[PDB]
mmCIF file of C-alpha atoms and ligand atoms in Angstrom:
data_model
loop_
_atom_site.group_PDB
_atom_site.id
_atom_site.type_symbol
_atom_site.label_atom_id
_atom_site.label_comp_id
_atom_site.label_asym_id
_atom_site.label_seq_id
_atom_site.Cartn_x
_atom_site.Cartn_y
_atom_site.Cartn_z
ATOM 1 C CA UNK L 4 149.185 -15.188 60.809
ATOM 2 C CA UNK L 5 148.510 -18.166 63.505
ATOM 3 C CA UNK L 6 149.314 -21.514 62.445
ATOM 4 C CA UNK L 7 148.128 -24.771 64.055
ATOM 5 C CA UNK L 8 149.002 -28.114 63.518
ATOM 6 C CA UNK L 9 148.191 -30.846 61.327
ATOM 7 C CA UNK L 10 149.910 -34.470 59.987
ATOM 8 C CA UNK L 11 150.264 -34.391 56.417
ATOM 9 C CA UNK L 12 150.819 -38.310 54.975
ATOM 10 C CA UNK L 13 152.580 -38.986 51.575
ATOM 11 C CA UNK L 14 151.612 -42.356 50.485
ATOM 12 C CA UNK L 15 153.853 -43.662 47.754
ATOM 13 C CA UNK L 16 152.194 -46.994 45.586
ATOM 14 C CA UNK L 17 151.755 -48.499 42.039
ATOM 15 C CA UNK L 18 149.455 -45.930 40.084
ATOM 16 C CA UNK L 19 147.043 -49.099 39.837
ATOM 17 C CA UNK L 20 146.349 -48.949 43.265
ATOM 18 C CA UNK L 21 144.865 -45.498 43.436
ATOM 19 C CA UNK L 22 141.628 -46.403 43.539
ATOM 20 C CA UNK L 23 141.676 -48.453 46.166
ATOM 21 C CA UNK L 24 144.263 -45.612 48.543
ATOM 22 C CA UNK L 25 141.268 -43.020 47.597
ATOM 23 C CA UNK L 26 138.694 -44.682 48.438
ATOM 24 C CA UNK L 27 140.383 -45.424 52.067
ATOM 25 C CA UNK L 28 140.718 -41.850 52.241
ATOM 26 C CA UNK L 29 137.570 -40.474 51.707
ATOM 27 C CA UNK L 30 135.749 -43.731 54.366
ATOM 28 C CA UNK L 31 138.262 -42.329 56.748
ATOM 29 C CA UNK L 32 136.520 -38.674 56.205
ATOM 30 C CA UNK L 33 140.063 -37.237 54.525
ATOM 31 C CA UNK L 34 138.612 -33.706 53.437
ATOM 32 C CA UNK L 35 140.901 -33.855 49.869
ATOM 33 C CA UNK L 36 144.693 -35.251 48.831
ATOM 34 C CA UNK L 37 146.918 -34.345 45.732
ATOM 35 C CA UNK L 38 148.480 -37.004 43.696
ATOM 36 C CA UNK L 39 151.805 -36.782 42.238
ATOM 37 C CA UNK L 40 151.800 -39.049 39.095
ATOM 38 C CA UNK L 41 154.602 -40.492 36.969
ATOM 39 C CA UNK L 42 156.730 -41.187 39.454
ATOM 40 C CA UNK L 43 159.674 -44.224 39.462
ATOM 41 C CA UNK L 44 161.636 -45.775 42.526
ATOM 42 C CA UNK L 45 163.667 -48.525 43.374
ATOM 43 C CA UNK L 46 164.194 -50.912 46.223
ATOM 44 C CA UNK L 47 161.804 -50.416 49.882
ATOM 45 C CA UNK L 48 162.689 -47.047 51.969
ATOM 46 C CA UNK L 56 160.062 -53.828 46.467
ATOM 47 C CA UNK L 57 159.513 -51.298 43.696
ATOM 48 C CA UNK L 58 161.059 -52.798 40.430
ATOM 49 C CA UNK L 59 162.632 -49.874 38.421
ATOM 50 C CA UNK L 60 160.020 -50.317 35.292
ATOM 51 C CA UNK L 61 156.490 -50.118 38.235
ATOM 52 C CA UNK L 62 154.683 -46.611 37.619
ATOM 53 C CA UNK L 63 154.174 -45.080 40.776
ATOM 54 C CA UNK L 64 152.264 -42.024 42.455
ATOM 55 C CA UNK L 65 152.343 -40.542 45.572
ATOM 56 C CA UNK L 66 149.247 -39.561 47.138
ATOM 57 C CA UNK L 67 149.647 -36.343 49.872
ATOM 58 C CA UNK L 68 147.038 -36.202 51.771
ATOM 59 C CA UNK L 69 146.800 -33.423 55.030
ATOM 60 C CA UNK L 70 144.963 -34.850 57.840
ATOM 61 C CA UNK L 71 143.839 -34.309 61.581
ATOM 62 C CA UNK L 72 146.061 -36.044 63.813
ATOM 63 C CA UNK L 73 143.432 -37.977 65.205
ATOM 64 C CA UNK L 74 142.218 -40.061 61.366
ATOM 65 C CA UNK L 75 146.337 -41.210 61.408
ATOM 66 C CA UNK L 76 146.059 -44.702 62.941
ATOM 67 C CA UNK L 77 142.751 -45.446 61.763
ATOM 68 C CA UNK L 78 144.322 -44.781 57.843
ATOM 69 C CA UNK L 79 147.771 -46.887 58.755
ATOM 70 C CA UNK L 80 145.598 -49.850 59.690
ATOM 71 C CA UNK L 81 143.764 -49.194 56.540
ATOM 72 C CA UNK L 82 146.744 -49.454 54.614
ATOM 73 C CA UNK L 83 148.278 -52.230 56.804
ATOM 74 C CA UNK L 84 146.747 -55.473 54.900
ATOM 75 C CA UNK L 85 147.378 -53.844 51.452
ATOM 76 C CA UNK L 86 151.112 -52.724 52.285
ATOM 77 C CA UNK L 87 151.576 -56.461 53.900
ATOM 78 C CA UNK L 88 151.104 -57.219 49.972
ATOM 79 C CA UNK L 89 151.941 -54.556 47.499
ATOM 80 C CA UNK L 90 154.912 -52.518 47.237
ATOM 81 C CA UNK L 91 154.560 -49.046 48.885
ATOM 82 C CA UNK L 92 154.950 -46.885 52.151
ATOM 83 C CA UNK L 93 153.430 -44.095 54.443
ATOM 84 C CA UNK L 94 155.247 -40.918 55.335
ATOM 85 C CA UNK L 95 153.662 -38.748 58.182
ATOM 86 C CA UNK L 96 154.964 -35.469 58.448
ATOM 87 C CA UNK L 97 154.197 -32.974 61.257
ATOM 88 C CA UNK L 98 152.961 -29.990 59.246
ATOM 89 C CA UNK L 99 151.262 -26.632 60.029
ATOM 90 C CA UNK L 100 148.255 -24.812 58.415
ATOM 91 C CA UNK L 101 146.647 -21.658 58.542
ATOM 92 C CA UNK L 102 142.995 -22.598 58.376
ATOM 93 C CA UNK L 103 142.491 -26.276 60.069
ATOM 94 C CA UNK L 104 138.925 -26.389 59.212
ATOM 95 C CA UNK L 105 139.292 -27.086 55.760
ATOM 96 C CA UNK L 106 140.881 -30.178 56.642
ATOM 97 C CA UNK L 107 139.091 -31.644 60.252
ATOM 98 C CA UNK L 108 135.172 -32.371 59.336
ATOM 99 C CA UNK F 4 150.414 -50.171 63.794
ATOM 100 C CA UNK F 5 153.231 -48.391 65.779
ATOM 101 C CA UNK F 6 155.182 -45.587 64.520
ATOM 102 C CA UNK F 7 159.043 -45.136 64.363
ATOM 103 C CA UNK F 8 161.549 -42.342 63.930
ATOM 104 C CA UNK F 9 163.322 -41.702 60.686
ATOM 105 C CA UNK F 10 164.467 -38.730 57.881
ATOM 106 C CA UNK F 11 163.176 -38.344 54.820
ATOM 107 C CA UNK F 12 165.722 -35.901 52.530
ATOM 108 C CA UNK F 13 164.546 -34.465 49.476
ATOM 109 C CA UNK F 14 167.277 -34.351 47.030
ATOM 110 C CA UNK F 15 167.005 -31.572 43.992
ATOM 111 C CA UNK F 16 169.281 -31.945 41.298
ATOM 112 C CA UNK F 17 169.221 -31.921 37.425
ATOM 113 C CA UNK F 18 168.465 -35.212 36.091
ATOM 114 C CA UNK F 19 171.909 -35.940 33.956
ATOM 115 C CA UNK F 20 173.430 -36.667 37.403
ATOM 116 C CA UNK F 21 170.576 -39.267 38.411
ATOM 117 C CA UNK F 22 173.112 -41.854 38.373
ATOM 118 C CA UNK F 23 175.727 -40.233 40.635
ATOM 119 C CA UNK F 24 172.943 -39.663 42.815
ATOM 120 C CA UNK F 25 171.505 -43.261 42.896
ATOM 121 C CA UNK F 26 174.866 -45.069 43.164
ATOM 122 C CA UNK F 27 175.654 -42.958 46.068
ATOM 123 C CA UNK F 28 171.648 -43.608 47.983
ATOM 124 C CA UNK F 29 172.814 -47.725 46.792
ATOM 125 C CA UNK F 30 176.782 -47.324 48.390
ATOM 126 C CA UNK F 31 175.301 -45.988 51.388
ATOM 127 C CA UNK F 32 173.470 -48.678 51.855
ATOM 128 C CA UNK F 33 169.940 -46.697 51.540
ATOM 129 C CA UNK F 34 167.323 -49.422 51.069
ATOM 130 C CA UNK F 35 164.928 -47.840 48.508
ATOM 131 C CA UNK F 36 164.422 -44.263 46.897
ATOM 132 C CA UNK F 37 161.515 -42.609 44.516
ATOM 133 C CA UNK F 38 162.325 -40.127 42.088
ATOM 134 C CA UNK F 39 159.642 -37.734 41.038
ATOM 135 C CA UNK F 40 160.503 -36.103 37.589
ATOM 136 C CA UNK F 41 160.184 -33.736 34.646
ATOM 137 C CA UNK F 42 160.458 -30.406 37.711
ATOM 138 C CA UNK F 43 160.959 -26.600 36.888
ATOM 139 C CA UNK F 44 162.472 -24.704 39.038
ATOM 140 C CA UNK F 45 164.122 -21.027 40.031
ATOM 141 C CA UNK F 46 167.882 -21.227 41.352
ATOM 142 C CA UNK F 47 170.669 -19.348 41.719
ATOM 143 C CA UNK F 48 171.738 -19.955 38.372
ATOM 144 C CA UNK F 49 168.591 -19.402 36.910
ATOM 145 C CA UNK F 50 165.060 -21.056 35.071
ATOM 146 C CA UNK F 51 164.587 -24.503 34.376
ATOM 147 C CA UNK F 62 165.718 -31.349 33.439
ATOM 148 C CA UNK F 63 165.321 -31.423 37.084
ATOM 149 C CA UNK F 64 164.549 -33.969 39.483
ATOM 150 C CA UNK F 65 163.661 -34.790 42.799
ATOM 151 C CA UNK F 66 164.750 -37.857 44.692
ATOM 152 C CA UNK F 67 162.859 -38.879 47.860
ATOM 153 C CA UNK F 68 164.546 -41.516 50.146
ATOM 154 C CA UNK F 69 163.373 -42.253 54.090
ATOM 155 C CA UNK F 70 166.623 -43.009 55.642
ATOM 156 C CA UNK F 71 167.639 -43.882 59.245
ATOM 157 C CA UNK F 72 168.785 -40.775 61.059
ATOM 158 C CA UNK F 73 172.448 -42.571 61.792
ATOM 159 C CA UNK F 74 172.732 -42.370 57.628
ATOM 160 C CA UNK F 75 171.938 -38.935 56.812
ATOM 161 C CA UNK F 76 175.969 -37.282 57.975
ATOM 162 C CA UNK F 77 177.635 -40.374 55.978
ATOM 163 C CA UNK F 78 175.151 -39.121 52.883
ATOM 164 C CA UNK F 79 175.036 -35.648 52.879
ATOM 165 C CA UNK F 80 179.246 -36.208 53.590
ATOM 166 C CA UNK F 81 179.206 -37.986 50.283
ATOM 167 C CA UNK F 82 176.635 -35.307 48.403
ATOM 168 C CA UNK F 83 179.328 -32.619 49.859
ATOM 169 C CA UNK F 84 181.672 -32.527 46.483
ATOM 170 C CA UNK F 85 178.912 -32.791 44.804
ATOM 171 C CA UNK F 86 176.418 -29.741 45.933
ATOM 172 C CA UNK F 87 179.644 -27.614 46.290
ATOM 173 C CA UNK F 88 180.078 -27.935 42.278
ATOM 174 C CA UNK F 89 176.455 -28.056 41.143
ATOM 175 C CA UNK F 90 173.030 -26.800 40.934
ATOM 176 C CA UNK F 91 170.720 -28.504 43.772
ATOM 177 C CA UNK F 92 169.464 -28.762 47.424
ATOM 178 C CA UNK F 93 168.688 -31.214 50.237
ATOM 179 C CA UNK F 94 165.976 -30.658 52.569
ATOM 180 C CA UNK F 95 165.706 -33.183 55.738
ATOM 181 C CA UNK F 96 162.775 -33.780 56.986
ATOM 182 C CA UNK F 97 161.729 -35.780 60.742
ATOM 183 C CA UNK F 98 159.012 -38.046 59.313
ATOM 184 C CA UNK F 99 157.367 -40.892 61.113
ATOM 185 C CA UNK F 100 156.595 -44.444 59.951
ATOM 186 C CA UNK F 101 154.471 -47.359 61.270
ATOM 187 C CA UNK F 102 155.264 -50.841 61.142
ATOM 188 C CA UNK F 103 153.037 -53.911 62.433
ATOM 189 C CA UNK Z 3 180.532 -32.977 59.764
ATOM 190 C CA UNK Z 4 178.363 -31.321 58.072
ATOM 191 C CA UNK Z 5 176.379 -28.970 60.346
ATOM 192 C CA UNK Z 6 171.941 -28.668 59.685
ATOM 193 C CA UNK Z 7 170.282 -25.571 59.965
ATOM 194 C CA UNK Z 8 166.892 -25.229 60.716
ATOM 195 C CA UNK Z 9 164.133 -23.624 57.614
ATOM 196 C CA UNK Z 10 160.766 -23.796 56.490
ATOM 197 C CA UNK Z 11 159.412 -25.728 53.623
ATOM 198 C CA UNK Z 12 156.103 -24.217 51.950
ATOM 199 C CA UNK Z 13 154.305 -26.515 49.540
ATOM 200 C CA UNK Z 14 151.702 -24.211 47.718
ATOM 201 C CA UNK Z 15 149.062 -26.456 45.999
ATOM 202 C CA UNK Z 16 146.972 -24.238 43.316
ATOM 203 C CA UNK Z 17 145.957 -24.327 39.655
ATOM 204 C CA UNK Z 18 148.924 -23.775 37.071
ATOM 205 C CA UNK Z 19 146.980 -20.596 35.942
ATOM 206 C CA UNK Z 20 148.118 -18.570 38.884
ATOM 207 C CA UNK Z 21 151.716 -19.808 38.840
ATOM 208 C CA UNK Z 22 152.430 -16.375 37.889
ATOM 209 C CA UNK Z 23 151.223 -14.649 40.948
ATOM 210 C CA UNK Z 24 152.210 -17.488 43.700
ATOM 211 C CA UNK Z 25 156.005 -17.152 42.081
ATOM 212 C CA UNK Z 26 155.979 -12.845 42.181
ATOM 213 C CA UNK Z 27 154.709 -13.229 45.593
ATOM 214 C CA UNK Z 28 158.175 -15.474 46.362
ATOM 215 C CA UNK Z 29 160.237 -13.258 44.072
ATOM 216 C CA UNK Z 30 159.150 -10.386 46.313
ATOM 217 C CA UNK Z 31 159.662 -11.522 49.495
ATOM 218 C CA UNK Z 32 162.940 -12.809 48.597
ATOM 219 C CA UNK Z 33 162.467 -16.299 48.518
ATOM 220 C CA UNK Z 34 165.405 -17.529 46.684
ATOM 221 C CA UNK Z 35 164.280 -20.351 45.006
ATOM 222 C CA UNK Z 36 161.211 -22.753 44.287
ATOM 223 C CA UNK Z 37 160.598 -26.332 42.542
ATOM 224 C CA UNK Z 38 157.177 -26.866 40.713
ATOM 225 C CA UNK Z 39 156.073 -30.253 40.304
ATOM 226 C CA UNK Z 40 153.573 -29.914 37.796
ATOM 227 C CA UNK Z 41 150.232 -31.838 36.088
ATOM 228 C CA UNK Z 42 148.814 -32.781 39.571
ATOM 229 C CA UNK Z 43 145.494 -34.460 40.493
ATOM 230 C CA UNK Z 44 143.752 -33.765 43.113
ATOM 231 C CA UNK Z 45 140.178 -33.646 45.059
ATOM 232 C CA UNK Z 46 138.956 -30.326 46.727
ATOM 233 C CA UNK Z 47 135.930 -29.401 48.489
ATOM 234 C CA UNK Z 48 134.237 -28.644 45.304
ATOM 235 C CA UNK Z 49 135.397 -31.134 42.925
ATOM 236 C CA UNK Z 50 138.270 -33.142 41.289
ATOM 237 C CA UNK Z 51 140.685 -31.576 39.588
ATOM 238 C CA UNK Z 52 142.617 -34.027 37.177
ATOM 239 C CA UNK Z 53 145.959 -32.493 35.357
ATOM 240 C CA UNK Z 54 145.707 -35.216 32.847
ATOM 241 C CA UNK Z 55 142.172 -33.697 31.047
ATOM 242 C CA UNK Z 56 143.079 -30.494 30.317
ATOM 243 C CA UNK Z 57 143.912 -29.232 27.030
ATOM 244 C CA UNK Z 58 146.288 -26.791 28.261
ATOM 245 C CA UNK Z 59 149.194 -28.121 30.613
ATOM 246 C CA UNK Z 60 149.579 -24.872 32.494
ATOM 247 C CA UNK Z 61 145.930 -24.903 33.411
ATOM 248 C CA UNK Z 62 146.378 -28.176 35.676
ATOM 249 C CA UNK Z 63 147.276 -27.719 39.299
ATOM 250 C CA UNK Z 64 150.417 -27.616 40.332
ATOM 251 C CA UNK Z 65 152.583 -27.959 43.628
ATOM 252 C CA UNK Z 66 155.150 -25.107 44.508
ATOM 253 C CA UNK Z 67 157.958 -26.486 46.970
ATOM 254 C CA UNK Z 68 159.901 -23.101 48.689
ATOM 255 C CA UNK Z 69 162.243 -23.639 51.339
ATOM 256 C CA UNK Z 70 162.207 -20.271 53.313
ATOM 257 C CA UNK Z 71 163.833 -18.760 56.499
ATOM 258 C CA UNK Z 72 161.600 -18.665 58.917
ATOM 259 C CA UNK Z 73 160.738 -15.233 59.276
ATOM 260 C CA UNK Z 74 159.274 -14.923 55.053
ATOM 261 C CA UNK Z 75 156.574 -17.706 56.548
ATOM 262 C CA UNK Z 76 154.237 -14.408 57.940
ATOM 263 C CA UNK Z 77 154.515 -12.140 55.101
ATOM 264 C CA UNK Z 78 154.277 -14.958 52.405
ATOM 265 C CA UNK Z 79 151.202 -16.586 54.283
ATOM 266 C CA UNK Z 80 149.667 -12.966 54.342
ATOM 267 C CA UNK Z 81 150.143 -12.570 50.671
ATOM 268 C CA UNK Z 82 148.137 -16.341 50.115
ATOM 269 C CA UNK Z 83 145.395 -14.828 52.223
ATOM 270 C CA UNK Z 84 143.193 -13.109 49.924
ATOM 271 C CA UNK Z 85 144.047 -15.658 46.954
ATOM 272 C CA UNK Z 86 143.111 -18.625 49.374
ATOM 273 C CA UNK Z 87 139.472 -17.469 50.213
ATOM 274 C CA UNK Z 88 138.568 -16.620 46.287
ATOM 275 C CA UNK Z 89 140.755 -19.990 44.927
ATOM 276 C CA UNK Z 90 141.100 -22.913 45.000
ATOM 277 C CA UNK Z 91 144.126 -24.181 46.815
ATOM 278 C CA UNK Z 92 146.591 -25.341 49.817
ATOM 279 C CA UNK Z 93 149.689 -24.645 51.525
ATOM 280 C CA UNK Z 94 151.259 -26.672 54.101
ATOM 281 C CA UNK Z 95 154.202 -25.567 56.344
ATOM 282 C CA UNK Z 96 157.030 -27.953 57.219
ATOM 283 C CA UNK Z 97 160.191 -27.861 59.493
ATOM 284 C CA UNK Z 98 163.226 -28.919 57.653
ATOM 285 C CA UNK Z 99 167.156 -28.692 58.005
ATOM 286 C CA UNK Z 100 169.725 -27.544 55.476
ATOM 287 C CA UNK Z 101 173.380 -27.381 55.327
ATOM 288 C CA UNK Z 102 173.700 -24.400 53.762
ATOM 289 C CA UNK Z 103 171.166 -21.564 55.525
ATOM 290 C CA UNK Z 104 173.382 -18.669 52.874
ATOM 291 C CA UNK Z 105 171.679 -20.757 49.790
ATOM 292 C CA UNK Z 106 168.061 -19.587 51.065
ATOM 293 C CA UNK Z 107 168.293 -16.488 53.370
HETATM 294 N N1 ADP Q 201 143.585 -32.331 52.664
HETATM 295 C C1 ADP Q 201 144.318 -32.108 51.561
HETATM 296 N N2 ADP Q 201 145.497 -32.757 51.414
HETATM 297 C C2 ADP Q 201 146.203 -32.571 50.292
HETATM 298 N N3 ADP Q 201 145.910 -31.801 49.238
HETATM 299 C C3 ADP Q 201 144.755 -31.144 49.426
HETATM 300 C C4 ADP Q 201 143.919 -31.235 50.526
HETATM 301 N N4 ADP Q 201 142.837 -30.377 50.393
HETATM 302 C C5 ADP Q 201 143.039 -29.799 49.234
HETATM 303 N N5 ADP Q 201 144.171 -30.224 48.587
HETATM 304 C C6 ADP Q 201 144.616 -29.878 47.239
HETATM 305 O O1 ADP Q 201 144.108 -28.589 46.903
HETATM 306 C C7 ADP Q 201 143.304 -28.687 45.711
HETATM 307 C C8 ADP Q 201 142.195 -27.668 45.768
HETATM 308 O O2 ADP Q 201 141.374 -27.921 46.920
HETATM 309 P P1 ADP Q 201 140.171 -26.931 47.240
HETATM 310 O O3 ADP Q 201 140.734 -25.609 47.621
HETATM 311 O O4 ADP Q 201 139.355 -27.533 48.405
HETATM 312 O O5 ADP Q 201 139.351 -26.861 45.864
HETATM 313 P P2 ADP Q 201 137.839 -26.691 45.356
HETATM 314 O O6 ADP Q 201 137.034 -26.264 46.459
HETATM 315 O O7 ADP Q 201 137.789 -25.664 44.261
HETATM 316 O O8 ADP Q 201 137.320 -27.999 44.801
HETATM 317 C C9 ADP Q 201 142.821 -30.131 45.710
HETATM 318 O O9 ADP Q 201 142.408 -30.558 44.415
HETATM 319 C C10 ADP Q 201 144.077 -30.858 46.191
HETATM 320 O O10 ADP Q 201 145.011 -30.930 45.132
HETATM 321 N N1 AMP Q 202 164.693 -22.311 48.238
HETATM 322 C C1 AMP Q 202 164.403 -23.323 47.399
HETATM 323 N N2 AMP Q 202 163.227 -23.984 47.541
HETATM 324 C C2 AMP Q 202 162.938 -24.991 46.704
HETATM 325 N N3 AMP Q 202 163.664 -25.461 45.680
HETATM 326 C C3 AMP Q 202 164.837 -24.808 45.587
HETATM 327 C C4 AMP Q 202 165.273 -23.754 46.379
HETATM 328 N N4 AMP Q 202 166.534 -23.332 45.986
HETATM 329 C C5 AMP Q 202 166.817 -24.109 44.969
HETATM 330 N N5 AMP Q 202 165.839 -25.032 44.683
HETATM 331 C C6 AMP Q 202 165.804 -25.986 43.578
HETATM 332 O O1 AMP Q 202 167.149 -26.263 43.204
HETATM 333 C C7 AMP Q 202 167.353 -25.911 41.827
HETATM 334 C C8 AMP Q 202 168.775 -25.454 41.623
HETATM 335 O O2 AMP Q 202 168.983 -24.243 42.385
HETATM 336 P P1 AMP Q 202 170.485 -23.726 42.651
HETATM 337 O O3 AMP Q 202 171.228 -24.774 43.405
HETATM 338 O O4 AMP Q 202 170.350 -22.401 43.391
HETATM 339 O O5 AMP Q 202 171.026 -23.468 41.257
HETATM 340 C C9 AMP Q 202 166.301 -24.840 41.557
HETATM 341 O O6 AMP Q 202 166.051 -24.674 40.168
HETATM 342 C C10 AMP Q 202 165.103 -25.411 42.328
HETATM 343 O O7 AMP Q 202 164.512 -26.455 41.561
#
């Protein structure tokens, strides 16, 4: 019944980047992330309306935040894409804090 | 990296009013949006054709938008959920 | 002008094969309504899980999105218990606002 919190980042980027976003993830020690394929935008919240995108969500300690923005920082300087963090809570924070 | 304020809605609706929904995201001067498609759902109207469009929008935006959803959501299926997010710019 | 109201959002992250039991467990508390994105991806503790391999759709894992009053949040969690420690699976609770609190309590 207790929840406790945790930052939960939806990273939204061309589908042919995904290697690259997963693999920053897992150096960073991110425990797991769910990717939400097929996905189409337009504009910068620049995706061109024809780009296949995903967006990687990704629950995370608050602590592995900054260190995965700076990852992302050279790559988002370049390629479309963004970062959402989102104040969430969890019932079981282990499963996501090594 | 340091990291600023802003909404994120989620905006359900069925996909043959995309374009009412875009146009209005584009009037209001909303600077980019991602749709994530081909959703099922359970509504007051029943089963599901459904989409969901994502856009991260200044807080000062989100009464002008849902003002202009308003006719809209009053006469068909669908829901907006605002969220506080954060983002971080160099 | 238009006044926000403050709710829950669950996103329930399981395989597709227990859809069933995730959505009679919202029915039942009186949950309102729900939006499934389906064919995920994902990686677990165990393993990947890619929506894209299997030969049945509803076998890949899906993401249930359930905007709930805040007081279904205890019971619901309660009912994901016992399926969370024998499955695989996730849910994350966020704060959100509405406009129309009647829609989903
Ligand atoms: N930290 C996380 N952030 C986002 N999604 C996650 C996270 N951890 C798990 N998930 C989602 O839950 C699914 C199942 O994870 P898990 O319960 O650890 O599975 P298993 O142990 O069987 O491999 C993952 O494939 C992913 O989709
Ligand atoms: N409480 C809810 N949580 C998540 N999605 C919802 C909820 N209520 C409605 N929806 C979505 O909105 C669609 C239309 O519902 P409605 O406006 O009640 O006809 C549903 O089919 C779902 O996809």
């Amino acid at each position: 019944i207790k929840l406790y919190p945790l930052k939960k980042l939806e990273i939204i980027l061309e589908g042919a980047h995904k290697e690259f976003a997963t693999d920053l993830l897992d150096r960073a020690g991110v425990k797991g992330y769910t990717i939400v394929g097929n996905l189409s935008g337009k504009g910068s919240h620049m995706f061109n309306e024809d780009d296949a995108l995903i967006m990687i969500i990704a629950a995370v300690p608050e602590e592995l935040v900054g260190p995965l923005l700076e990852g992302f920082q050279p790559f988002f300087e370049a390629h479309s894409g963004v970062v959402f963090v989102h104040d969430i809570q969890v019932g079981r924070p282990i499963k996501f804090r090594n």
